[PDB]
């Protein structure tokens, strides 16, 4: 009593993400930098993530936004006209990002703020995307040969890439197999991939 499968594959997930991440509005470098500084500060504060998500109202807000304190306000200033009205084409990709971030832990939000601050989004994006592509089918537990250290990522217990993946429910090792795919990790790994792709897209 439905069409297609319950679950997409990596190609389908990447296509879904790219309908947003590859169709973003163009931002001038100064506006782009202010937006990224704002998002970095929002990722470091659980209340700022909530306040920003509430202000955007999934793109349904009518009327000028209420001014917010701190980083959530700094992001809102990059998405509104001088009147305080939200621009849907600027706000809707941020709504998708906030939606994906709801699946991630506070530890992962702080690591994404560090990745943003250090302009290191592509490394983690490639690692997560490669693990999602190579772990087909996601319903089955499997050991993988991909060694994250050989892709230029720091790898070992407590390294940023290690914590980011461990927080998804993957089983990690310092020796091969470095990563074991667990079906329980599907949602968090997909959300992490979408969040890194959107942050990379927003960074232009």
């Amino acid at each position: 009593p439905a069409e297609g499968a319950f679950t997409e594959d990596f190609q389908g997930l990447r296509a879904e993400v790219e309908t947003i991440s590859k169709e973003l509005e163009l931002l001038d470098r100064e506006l782009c930098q202010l937006l990224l500084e704002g998002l970095e500060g929002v990722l470091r504060d659980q209340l700022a993530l909530r306040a920003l998500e509430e202000a955007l109202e999934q793109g349904q807000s009518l009327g000028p936004v209420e001014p917010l304190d701190g980083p959530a306000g700094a992001v809102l200033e990059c998405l509104v006209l001088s009147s305080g009205m939200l621009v849907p084409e600027l706000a809707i990709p941020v709504v998708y990002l906030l939606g994906a971030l709801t699946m991630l832990s506070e530890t992962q939000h702080k690591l994404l703020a560090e990745a943003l601050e250090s302009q290191t989004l592509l490394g983690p994006l490639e690692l997560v995307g490669s693990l999602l592509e190579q772990s087909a089918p996601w319903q089955e537990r499997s050991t993988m040969s991909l060694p994250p250290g050989l892709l230029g990522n720091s790898w070992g217990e407590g390294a940023p890439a290690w914590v980011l993946l461990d927080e998804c429910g993957l089983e990690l090792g310092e020796d091969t197999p470095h990563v074991c795919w667990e079906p329980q990790a599907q949602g968090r790994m997909c959300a992490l991939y979408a969040s890194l792709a959107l942050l990379s897209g927003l960074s232009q």
């Binding site: 509005e25 163009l26 931002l27 001038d28 100064e30 506006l31 202010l34 990059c78 001088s82 621009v87 600027l90």
Partner: peptide
């Protein structure tokens, strides 16, 4: 050839 695109700037 050239093409016109919309670019958002800080006020």
């Amino acid at each position: 050839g050239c093409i016109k695109k919309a670019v958002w700037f800080k006020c």
